[PDB]
Amino acid sequence: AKTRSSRAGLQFPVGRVHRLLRKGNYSERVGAGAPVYLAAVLEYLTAEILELAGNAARDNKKTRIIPRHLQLAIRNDEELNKLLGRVTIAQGGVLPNIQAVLLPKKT
C-alpha cells in the first residue's frame, strides 16, 4: 500500500487534493489525473516562492524565512507579482521605493 504522491514523485498530498476537489463542489466527477496535476502545480509554485523568499532571507543574514522575505521575493519578481496582484501579505511591508523627483539634486 503506497501513497499516490510517491507514485507521482511528489511531496504535496495527491490524496488530500483529490478529496478537496470532490468535496469543494467544483464538479460531480473528478478525474484521477486532476489531483496529481493540481498537487504538482501547487508544489511547483510553493517551491518557486520558497527559493526566492529563502534567498532574500539569506540576504538578510537570517536563517528563517519571515513574511518580509516572502513579500520581497514576490514583489521583486515580475510574474509572482502579477499572480499575487491583489494579495496582501500580512507583516510584509513594501519595497523600498522613493519617487525620483522627491530626492534632492545629487551633485
Binding site: 488530500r16 496529481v36 516562492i49 536563517t63 528563517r64 519571515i66 510574474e79 501579505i89
Partner: protein, 99 residues
C-alpha cells in the same frame, strides 16, 4: 487532560519538505508558514474554480487533468505557467506508469 484540540489541517509539513529540497539550511517563521498556507489555499480555489467553469462551459461532468491544465494556462503568467504545465505533466506521466 480536558479535551484535546480539534484537528486543523494545513499544508505546513509539505511546505517544510519542499523548503528543505530548495534551501536545506533555511527554515521558516510561524507567520510565514501561515502565509504559505493562504497562498496554497488561494491557488487551489483559483485553479479548481477555473477548471470547474471549463468543465461546465463544455457540458462536462468531470474535471480531468485537462481542465486543471487549461486552467493553469489561463491563470499563470508565462514562465510560471510553463514550468507548472511541465511539472504537472511530468507527475501524471510518472503516476500513470507506476499504476
Amino acid at each position: 487532560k480536558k479535551r484535546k484540540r480539534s484537528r486543523k489541517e494545513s499544508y505546513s509539513i509539505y511546505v517544510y519538505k519542499v523548503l528543505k529540497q530548495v534551501h536545506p539550511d533555511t527554515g521558516i517563521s510561524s507567520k510565514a508558514m501561515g502565509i504559505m498556507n493562504s497562498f496554497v489555499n488561494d491557488i487551489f480555489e483559483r485553479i479548481a474554480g477555473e477548471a470547474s467553469r471549463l468543465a461546465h462551459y463544455n457540458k462536462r461532468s468531470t474535471i480531468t487533468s485537462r481542465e486543471i491544465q487549461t486552467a493553469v494556462r489561463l491563470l499563470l503568467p508565462g514562465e510560471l505557467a510553463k514550468h507548472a504545465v511541465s511539472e504537472g505533466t511530468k507527475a501524471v506521466t510518472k503516476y500513470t506508469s507506476a499504476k
